[PDB]
Homo-oligomer: A and B are copies of this chain.
Amino acid sequence: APAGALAAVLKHSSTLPPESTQVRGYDFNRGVNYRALLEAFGTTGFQATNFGRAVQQVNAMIEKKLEPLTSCTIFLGYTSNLISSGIRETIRYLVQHNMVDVLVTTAGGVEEDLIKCLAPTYLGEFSLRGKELRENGINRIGNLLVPNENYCKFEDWLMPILDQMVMEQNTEGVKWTPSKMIARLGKEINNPESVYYWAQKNHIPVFSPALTDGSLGDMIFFHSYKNPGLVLDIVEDLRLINTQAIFAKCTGMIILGGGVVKHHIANANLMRNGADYAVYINTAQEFDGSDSGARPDEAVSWGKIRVDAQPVKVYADASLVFPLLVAETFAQKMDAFMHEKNED
């Protein structure tokens, strides 16, 4: 056999350091121990290992936090489609129990939480044809369906609030911004199933720099005809979110998806020279040079994540991953959170 071929293929290797962990998956001969099955993800490899790390990182944020400021300010960011899905429930649970500090989402992420209190969203199919659905006034969101009557109901609900918002702006001197508006709609919806109802109630601010890119925008638009003058300033909200990072004792970032939401949170944390913890769950890829698809390491070069931080990115659909992450982290510390509130 060719010598060089043998040498190339049969190259010797010294052993790895003792610290090395072996790949090993959950053994179902033990039966189904869900906690152990989930912990086994850590040694399963690929994205399973990253999920395992995300659980450790989020648990570290929480532990730091349990040591109005807290020991660690957690920013929770998500894209609109996640509020359309059932992840809306998971997010509402975290906010209801004051487990995160700052929320930032896109317009869809705001409006659809309120609308779900008015009418439901349904399961559909990715394959459903647009023409046929439009003839029925049904809007398609992935494999989910939002009947357009939902937005008609949203309009009926919202208009009276916009009348009052412009009145208050003009007679009471109110300076409206996306966060102030979102807090208002949250108080107005007055429904325990609402993310913003709870955020408003727990004084957790919600940032959304492009609040006008959606249904709420359409309503603001039409309403501006009979009642012109409403102003939504994005500058004041910039100061608010940035100062939360700046004066935080320590920060963690839990970001689902990419775009403005992801970038906006990481830019705020650059103001303090980087977040101390960062966990991402998104399906974007880096090859196109997009910010949305950038590995957490690129954020390190910008100084948005501390050079000594251990950021984790899980490549996967959050609808699948987020509830499992919450089950193994926040949900496992309910007593600790309550204890901090004097309820345990």
Cα of A305 to Cα of B298 in the assembled complex, Å? 27
Which of B81, B292, B297 contacts A46, CB < 8 Å? B81
B residues in contact with A121, CB < 8 Å: 22-23
Cα of A26 to Cα of B150 in the assembled complex, Å? 23
Q: Is A315 an interface residue (CB 8 A)?
A: yes
Q: Is A168 an interface residue (CB 8 A)?
A: no
Interface size classification for chain A: 35 or more
B residues in contact with A305, CB < 8 Å: 130
Which of B14, B37, B122, B213 contacts A263, CB < 8 Å? B213
Name the residue of chain B whose CB is nearest to the CB of A230.
B235
The distance from the CB of A289 to the nearest CB of chain B, in whole angstroms, is 3
Q: Given contacts A14-B136, A134-B301, A139-B301, are A285 and B288 in contact (CB under 8 A)?
A: no
Q: Given contacts A143-B46, A143-B49, A283-B288, are A301 and B86 in contact (CB under 8 A)?
A: no
Per assembly, the copies of the chain total: 4
A289 touches B141 (CB 8 A): yes
B238 touches A212 (CB 8 A): yes
Among residues 225 to 250 in chain A, which have CB atoms less than 8 Å away from a CB atom of chain B?
225-226, 230-239, 242, 246
Among residues 314 to 337 in chain A, which have CB atoms less than 8 Å away from a CB atom of chain B?
315-321, 323-324, 326-327, 330-332, 334
B235 touches A220 (CB 8 A): yes
Which of B23, B123, B317, B319 contacts A84, CB < 8 Å? B23
Q: Is A65 an interface residue (CB 8 A)?
A: no
